[PDB]
mmCIF file of C-alpha atoms in Angstrom:
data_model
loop_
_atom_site.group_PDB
_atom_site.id
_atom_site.type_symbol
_atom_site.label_atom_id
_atom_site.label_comp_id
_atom_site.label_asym_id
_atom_site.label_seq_id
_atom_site.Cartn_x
_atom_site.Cartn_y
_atom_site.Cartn_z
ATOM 1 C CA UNK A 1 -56.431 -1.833 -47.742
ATOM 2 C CA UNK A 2 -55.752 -0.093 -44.608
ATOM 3 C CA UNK A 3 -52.604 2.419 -44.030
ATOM 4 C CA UNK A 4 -50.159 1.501 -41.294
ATOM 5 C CA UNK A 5 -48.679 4.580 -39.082
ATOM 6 C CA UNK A 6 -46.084 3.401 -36.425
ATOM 7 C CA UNK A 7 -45.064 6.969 -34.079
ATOM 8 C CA UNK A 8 -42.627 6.030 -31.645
ATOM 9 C CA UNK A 9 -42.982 7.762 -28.126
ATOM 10 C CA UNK A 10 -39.705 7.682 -25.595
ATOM 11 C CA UNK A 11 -39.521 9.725 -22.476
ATOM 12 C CA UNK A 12 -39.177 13.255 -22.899
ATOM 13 C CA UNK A 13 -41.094 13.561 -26.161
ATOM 14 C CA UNK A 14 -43.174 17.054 -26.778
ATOM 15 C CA UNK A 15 -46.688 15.814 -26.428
ATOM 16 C CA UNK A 16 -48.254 18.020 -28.553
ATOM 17 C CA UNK A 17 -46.051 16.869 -31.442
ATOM 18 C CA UNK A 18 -47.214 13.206 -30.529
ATOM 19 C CA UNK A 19 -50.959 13.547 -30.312
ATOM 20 C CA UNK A 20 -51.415 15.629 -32.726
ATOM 21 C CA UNK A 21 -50.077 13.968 -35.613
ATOM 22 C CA UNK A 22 -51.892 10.375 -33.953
ATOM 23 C CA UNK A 23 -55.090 12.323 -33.596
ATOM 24 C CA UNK A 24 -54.944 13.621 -37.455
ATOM 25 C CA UNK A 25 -53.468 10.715 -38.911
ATOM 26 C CA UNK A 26 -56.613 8.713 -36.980
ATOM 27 C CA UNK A 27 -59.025 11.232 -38.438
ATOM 28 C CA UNK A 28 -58.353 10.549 -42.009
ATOM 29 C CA UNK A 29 -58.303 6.541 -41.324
ATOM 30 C CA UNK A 30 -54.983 5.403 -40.869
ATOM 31 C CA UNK A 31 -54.238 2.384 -38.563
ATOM 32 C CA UNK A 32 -51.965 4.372 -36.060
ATOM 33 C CA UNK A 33 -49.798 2.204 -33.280
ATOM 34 C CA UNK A 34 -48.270 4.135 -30.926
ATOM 35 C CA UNK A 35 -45.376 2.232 -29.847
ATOM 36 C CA UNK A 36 -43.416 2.922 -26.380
ATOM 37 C CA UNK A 37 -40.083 2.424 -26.645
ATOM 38 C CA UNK A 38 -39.160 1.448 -23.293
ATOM 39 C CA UNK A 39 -42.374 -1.153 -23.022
ATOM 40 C CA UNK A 40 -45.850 -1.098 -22.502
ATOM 41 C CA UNK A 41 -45.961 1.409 -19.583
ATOM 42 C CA UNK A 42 -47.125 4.828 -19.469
ATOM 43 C CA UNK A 43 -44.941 7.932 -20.908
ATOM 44 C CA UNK A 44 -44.050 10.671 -19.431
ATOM 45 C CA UNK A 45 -43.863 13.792 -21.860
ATOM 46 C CA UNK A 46 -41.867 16.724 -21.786
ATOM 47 C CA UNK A 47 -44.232 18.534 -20.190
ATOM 48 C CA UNK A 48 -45.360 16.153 -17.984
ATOM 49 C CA UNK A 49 -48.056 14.896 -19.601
ATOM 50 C CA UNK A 50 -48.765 10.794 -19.657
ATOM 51 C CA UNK A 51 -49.975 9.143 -22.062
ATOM 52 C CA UNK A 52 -50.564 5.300 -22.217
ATOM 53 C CA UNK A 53 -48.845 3.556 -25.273
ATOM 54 C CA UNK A 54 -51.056 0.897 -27.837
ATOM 55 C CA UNK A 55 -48.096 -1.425 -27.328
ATOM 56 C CA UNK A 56 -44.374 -1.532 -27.047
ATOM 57 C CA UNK A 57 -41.814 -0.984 -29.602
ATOM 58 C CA UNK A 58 -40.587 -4.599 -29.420
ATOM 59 C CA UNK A 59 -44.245 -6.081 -30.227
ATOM 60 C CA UNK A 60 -44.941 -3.489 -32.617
ATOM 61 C CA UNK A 61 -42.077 -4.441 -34.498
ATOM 62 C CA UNK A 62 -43.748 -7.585 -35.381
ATOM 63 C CA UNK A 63 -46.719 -6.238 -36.819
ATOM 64 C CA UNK A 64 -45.388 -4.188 -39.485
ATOM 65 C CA UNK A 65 -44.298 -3.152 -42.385
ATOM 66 C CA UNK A 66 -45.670 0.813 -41.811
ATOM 67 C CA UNK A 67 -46.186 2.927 -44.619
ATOM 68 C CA UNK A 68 -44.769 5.717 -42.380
ATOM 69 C CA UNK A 69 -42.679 6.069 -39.626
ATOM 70 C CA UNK A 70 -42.722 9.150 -36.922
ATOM 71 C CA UNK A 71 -40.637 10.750 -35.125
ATOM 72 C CA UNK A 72 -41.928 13.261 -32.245
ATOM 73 C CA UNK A 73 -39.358 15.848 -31.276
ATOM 74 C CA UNK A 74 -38.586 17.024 -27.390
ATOM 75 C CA UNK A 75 -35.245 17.252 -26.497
ATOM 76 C CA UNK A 76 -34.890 14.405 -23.952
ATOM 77 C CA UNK A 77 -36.938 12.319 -26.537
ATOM 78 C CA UNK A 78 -35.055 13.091 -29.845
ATOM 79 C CA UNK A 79 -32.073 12.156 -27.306
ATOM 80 C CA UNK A 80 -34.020 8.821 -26.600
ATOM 81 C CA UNK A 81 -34.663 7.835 -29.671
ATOM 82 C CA UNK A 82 -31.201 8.523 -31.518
ATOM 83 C CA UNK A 83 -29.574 6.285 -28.619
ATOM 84 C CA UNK A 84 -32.090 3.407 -29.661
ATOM 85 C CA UNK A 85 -30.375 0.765 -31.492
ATOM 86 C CA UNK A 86 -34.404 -0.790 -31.949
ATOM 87 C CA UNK A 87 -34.996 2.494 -33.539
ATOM 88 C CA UNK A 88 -31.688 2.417 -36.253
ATOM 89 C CA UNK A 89 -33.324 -1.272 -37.511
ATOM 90 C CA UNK A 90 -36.768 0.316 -37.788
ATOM 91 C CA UNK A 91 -35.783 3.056 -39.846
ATOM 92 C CA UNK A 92 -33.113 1.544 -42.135
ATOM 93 C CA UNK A 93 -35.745 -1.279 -42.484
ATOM 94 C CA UNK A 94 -38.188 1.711 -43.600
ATOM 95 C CA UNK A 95 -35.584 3.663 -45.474
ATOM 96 C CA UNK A 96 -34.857 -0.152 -47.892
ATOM 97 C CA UNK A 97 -38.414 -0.531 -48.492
ATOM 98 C CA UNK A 98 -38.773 2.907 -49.570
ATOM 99 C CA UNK A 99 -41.204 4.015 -46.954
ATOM 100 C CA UNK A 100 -41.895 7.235 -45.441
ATOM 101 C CA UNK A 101 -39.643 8.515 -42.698
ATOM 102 C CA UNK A 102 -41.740 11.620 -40.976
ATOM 103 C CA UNK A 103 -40.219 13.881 -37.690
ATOM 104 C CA UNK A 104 -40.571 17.160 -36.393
ATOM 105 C CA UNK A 105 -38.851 19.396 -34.473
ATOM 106 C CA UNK A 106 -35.889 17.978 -32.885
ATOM 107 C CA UNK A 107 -37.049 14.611 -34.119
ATOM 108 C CA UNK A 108 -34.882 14.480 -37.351
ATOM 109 C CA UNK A 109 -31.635 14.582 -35.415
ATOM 110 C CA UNK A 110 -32.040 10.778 -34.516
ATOM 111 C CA UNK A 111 -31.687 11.142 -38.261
ATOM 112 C CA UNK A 112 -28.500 11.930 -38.153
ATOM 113 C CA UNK A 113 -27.618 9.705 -35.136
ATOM 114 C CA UNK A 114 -28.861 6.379 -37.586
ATOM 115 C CA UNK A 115 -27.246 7.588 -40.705
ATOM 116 C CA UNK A 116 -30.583 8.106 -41.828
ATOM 117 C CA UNK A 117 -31.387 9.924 -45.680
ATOM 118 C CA UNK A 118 -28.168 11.532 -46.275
ATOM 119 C CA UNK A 119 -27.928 13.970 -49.015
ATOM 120 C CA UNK A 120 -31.805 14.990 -48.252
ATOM 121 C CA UNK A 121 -33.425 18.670 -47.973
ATOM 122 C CA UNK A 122 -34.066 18.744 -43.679
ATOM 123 C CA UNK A 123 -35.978 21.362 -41.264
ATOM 124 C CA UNK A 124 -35.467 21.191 -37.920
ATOM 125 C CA UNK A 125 -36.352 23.507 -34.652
ATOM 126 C CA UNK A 126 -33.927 26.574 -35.208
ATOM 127 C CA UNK A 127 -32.493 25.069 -31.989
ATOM 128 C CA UNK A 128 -31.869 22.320 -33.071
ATOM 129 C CA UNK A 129 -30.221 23.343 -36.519
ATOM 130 C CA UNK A 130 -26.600 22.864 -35.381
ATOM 131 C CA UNK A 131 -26.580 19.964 -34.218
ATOM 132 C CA UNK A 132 -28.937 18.371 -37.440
ATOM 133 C CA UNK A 133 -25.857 20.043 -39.936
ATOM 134 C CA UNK A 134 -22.731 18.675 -38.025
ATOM 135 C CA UNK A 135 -20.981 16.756 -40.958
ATOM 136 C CA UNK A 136 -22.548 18.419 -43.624
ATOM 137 C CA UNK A 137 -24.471 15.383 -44.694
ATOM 138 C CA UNK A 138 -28.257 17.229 -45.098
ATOM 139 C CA UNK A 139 -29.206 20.087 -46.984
ATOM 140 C CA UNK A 140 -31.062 22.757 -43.903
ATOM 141 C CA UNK A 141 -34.752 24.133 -45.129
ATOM 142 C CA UNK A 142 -36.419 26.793 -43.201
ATOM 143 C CA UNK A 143 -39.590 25.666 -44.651
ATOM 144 C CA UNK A 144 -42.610 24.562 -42.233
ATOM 145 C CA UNK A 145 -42.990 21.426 -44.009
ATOM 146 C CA UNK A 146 -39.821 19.943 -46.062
ATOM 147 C CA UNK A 147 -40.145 16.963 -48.033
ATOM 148 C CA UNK A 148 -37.072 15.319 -49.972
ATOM 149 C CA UNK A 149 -37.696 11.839 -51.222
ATOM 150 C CA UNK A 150 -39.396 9.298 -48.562
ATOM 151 C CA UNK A 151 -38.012 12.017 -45.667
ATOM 152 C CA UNK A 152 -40.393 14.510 -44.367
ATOM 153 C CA UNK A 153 -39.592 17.098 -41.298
ATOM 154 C CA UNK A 154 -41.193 19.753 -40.102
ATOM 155 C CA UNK A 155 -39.660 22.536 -37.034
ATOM 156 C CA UNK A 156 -42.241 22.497 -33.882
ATOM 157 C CA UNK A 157 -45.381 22.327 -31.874
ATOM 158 C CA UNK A 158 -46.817 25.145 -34.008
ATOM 159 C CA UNK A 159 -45.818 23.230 -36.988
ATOM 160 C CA UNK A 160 -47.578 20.165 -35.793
ATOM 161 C CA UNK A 161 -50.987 20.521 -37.533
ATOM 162 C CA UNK A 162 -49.221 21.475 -41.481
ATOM 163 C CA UNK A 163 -46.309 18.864 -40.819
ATOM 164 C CA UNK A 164 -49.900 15.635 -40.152
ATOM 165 C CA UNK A 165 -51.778 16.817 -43.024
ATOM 166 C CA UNK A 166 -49.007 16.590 -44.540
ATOM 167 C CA UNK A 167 -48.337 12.659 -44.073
ATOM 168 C CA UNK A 168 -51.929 12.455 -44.800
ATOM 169 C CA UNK A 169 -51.456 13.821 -48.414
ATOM 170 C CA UNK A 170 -48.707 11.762 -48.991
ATOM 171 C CA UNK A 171 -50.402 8.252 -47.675
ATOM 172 C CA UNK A 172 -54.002 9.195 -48.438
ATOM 173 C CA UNK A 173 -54.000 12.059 -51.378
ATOM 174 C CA UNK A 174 -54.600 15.426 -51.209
ATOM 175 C CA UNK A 175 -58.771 15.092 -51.066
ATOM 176 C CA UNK A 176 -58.342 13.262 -48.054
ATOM 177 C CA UNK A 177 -56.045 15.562 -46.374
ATOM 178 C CA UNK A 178 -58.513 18.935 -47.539
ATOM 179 C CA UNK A 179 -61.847 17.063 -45.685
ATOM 180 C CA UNK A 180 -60.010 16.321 -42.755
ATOM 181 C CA UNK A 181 -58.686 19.543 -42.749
ATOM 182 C CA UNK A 182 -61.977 20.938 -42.322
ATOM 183 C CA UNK A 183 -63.457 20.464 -39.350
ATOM 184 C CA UNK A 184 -60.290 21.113 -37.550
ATOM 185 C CA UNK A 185 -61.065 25.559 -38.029
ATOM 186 C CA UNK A 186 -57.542 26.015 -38.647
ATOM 187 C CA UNK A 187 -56.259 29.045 -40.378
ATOM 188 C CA UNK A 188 -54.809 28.075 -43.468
ATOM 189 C CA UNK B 1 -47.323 33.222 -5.856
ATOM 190 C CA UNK B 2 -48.161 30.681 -8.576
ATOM 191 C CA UNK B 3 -50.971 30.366 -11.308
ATOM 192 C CA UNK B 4 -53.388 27.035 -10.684
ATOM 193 C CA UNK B 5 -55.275 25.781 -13.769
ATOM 194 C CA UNK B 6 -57.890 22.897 -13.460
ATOM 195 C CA UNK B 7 -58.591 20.823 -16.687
ATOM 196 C CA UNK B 8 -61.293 18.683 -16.212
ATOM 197 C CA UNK B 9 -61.031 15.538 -18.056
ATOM 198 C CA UNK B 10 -63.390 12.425 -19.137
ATOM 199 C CA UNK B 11 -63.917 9.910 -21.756
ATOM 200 C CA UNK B 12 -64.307 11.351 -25.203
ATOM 201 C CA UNK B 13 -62.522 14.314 -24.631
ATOM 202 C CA UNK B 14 -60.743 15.728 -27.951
ATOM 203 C CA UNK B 15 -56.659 14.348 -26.974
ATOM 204 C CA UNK B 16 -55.287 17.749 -28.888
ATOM 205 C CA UNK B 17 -57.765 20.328 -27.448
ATOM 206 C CA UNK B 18 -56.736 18.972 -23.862
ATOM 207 C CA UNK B 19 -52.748 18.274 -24.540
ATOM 208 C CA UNK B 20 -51.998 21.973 -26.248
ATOM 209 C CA UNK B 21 -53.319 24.153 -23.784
ATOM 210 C CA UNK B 22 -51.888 21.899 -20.560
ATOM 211 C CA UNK B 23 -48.438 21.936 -22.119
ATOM 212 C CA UNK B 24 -48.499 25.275 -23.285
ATOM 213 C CA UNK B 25 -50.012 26.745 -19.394
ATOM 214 C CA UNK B 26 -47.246 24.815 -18.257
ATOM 215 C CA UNK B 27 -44.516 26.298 -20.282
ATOM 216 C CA UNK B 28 -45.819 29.501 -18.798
ATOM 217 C CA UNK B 29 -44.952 28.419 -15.328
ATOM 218 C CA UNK B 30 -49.139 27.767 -14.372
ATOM 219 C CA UNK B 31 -49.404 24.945 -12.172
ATOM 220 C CA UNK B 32 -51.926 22.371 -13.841
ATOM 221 C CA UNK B 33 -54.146 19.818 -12.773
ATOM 222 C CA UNK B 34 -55.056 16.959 -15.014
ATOM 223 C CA UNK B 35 -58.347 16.071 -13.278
ATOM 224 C CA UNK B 36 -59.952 12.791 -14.433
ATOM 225 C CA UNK B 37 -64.284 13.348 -14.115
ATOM 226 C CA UNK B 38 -64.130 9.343 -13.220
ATOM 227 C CA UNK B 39 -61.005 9.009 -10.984
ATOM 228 C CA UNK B 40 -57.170 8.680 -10.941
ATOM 229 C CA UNK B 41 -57.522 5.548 -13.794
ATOM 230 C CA UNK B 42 -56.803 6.610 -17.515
ATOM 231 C CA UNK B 43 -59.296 8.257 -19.680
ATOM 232 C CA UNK B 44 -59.885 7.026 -23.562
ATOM 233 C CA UNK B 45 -60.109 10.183 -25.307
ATOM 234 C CA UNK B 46 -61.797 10.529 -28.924
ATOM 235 C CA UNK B 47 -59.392 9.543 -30.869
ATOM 236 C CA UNK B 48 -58.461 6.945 -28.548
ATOM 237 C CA UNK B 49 -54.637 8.346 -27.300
ATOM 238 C CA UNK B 50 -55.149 7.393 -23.726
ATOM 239 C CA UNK B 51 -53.817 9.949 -21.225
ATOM 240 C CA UNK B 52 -53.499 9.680 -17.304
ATOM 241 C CA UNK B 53 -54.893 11.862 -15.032
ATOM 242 C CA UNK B 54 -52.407 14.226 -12.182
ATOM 243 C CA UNK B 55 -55.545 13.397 -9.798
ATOM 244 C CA UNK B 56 -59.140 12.651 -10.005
ATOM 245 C CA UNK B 57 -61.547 15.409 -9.862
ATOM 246 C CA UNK B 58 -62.779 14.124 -6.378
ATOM 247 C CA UNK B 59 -59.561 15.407 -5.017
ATOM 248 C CA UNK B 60 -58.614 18.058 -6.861
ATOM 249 C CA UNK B 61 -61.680 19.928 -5.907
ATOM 250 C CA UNK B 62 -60.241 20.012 -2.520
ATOM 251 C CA UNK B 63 -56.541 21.965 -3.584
ATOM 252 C CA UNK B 64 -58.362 24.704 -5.271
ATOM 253 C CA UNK B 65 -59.190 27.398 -5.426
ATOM 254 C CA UNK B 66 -58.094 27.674 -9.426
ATOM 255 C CA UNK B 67 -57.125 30.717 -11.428
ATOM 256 C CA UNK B 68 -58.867 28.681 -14.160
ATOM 257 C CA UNK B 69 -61.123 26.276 -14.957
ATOM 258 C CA UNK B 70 -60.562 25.006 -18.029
ATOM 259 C CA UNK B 71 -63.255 22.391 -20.572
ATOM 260 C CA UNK B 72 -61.740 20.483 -23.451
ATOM 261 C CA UNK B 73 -64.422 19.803 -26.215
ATOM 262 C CA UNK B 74 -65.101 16.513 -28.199
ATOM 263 C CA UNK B 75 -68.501 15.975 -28.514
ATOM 264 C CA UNK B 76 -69.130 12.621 -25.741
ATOM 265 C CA UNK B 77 -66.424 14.826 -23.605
ATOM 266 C CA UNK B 78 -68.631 17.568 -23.509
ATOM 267 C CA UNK B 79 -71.911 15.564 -22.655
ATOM 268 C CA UNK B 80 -69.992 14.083 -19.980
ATOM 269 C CA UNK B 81 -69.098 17.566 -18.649
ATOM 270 C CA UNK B 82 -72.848 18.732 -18.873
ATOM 271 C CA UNK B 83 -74.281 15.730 -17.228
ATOM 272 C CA UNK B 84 -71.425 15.859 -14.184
ATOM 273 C CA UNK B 85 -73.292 17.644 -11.031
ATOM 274 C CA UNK B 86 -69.137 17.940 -10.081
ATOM 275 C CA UNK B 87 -68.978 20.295 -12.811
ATOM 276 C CA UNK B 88 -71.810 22.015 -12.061
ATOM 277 C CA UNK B 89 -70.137 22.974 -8.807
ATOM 278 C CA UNK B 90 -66.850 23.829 -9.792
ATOM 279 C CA UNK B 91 -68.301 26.121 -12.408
ATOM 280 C CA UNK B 92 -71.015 27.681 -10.452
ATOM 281 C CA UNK B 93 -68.139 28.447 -7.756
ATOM 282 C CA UNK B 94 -65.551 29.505 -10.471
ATOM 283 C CA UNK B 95 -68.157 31.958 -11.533
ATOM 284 C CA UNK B 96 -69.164 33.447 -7.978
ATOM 285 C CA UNK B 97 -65.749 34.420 -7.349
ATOM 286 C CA UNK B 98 -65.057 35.777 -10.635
ATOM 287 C CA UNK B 99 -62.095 33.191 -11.976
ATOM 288 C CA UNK B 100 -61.831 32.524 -15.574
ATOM 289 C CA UNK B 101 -63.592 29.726 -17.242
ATOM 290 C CA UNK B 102 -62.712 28.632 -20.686
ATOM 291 C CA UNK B 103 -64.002 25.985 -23.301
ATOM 292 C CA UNK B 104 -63.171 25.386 -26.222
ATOM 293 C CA UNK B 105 -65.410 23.664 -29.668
ATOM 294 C CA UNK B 106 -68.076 21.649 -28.020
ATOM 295 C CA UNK B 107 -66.766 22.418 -24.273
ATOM 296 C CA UNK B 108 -68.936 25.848 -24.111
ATOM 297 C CA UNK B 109 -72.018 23.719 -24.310
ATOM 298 C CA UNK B 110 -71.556 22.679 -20.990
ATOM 299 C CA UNK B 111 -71.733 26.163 -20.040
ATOM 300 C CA UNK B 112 -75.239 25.895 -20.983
ATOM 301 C CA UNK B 113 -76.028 22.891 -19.339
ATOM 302 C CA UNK B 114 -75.099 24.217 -15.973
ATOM 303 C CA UNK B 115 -76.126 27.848 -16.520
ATOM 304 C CA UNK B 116 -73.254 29.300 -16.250
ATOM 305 C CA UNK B 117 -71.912 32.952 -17.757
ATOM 306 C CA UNK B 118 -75.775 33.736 -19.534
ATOM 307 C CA UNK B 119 -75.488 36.788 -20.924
ATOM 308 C CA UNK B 120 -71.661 36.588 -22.179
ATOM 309 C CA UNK B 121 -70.574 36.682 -25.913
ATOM 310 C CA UNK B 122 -69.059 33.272 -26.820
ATOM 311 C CA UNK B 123 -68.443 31.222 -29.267
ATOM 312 C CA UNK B 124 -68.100 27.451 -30.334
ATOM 313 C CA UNK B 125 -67.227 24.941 -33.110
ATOM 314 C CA UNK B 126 -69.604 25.569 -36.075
ATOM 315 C CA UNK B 127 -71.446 22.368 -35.208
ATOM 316 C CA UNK B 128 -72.114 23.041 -31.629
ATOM 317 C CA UNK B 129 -73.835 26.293 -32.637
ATOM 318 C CA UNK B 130 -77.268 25.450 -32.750
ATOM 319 C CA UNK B 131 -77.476 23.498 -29.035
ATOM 320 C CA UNK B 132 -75.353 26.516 -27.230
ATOM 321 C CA UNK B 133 -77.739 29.109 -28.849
ATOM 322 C CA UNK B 134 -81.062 26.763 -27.872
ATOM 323 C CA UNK B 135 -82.961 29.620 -25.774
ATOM 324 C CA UNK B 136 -81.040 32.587 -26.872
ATOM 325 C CA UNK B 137 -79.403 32.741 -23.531
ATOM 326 C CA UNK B 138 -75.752 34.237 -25.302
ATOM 327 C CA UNK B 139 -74.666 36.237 -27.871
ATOM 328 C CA UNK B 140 -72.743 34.210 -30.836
ATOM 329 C CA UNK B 141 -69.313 35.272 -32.358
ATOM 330 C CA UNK B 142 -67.474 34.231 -34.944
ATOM 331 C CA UNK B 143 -64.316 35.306 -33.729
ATOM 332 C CA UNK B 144 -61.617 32.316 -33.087
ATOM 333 C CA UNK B 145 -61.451 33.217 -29.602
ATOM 334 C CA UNK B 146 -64.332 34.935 -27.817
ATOM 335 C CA UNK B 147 -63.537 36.800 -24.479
ATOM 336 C CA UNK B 148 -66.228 38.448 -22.769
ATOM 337 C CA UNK B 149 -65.729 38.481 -18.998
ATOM 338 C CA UNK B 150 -64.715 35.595 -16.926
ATOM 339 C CA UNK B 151 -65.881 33.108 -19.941
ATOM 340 C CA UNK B 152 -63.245 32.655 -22.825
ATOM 341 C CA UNK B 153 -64.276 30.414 -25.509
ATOM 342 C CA UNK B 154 -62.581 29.286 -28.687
ATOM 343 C CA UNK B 155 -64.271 27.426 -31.539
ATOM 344 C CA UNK B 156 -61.845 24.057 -32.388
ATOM 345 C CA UNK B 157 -58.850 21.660 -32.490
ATOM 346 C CA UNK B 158 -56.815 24.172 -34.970
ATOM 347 C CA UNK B 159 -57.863 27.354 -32.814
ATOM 348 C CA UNK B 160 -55.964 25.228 -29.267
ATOM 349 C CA UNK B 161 -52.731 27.672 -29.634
ATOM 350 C CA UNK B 162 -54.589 30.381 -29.664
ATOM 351 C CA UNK B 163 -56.960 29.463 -27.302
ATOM 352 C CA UNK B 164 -54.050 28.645 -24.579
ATOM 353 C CA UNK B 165 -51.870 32.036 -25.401
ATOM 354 C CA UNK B 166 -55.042 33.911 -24.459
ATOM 355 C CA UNK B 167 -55.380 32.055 -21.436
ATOM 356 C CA UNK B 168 -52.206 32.626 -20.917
ATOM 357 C CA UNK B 169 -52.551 36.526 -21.524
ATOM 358 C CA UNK B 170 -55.657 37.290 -18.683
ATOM 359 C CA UNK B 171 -53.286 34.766 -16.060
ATOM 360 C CA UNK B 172 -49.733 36.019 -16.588
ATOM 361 C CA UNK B 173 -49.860 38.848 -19.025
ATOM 362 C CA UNK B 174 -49.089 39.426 -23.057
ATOM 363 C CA UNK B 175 -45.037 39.839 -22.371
ATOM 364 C CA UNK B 176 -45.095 35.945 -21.054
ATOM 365 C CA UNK B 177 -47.798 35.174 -23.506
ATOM 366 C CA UNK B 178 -45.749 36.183 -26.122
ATOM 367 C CA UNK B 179 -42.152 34.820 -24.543
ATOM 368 C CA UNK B 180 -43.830 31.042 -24.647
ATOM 369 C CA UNK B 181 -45.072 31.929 -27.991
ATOM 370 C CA UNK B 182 -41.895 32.386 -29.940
ATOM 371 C CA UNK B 183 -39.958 29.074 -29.554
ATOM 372 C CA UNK B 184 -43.588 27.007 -30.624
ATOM 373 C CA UNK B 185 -43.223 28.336 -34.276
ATOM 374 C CA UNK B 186 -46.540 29.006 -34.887
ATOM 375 C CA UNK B 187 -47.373 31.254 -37.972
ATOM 376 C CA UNK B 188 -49.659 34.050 -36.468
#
């Protein structure tokens, strides 16, 4: 009876955007996997940190489904993960079984890359606006938080924090999401 | 001519309070140093994201002097700082040539442990109040972040932007503070 969270971490990813959404999501007692996408080894982050993955992306695979997906942002690792043909089969897979498709910052443009919820409401980094609208095929938000359908986005580090709660009210319900909230002193 | 920050890390350490401020220092051109209290191998943090040190702390003690000194909370990460006779001498030394020390929701407590900045206005998470007030030896604030002297404190895992930005501020100044801040989207 246990939520499933699969965040997918390629090189270049902004670390902030992957551990805090893991560390949330792990607070309100979701099974999270954080799955490398070149293996097993360590990461290294956009800015430089490294973090050690749970397993890799191939093994992962095998142990789903996931009641969400997510997608960290960071240039290099958007760039990573839209380039990922592993990645396309995990989220058309997610976006069949009507499951929840989560990324932040410039995370939603592998989105776009994998033909991913077309016709949805996006956010994205300002920065990475252009590039998210080429085609036409998504409605831009400049909402912290946007949620169309099974697609939820969110714009940057500073967004981090609203954008997990957020997947928590959606997996867990909104009581869940207000006493995890607590202890964390944030400001609204 | 460039800005060294020491984070001190070990088991049980809260992942987001340690990832924000490291990545955000480094966006503002500080050169940080991971340092693992155990060694070089990879440290378990609280929520169990698994991060790898730059160095242990062994070694890094040996490239300072830092600019500053910086404790992560989560509650084992904090005990492990207090009980560490390393930290005790990195923060007496930090203290007797007047670089900044900063910890943030349980970290301050090991403040108190190695008597260190008595006297000073700080504050902590809610929870850690009553053991960093045990003897009366500081002044409590409410304030989000607490800056009185060389010891900046901040109170939790949703204060960590803030808490970095001010660190930011005393090294490099509130034009750079505020140059890192704008692409992060925070709210405030």
């Amino acid at each position: 009876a246990s939520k499933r969270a699969l965040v997918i971490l390629a090189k270049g990813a902004e670390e902030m955007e992957t551990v805090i959404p893991v560390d949330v999501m792990r607070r309100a007692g979701i099974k999270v996997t954080v799955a490398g996408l070149a293996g097993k080894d360590p990461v290294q982050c956009s800015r430089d940190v490294v973090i050690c993955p749970d397993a890799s992306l191939e093994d992962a695979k095998k142990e789903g489904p996931y009641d969400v997906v997510v997608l960290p942002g960071g240039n290099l690792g958007a760039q990573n993960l839209s380039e990922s043909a592993a990645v396309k089969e995990i989220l058309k897979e997610q976006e069949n079984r009507k499951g929840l498709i989560a990324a932040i910052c410039a995370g939603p443009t592998a989105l776009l890359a994998h033909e991913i919820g077309f016709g949805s409401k996006v956010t994205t980094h300002p920065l990475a606006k252009d590039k998210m609208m080429n085609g036409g095929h998504y409605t831009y938000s400049e909402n912290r938080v946007e949620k169309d359908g099974l697609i939820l986005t969110s714009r940057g580090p500073g967004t981090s924090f609203e954008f997990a709660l957020a997947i928590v009210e959606a997996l867990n319900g909104k009581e869940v999401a207000a006493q995890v909230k607590a202890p964390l002193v944030l400001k609204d």
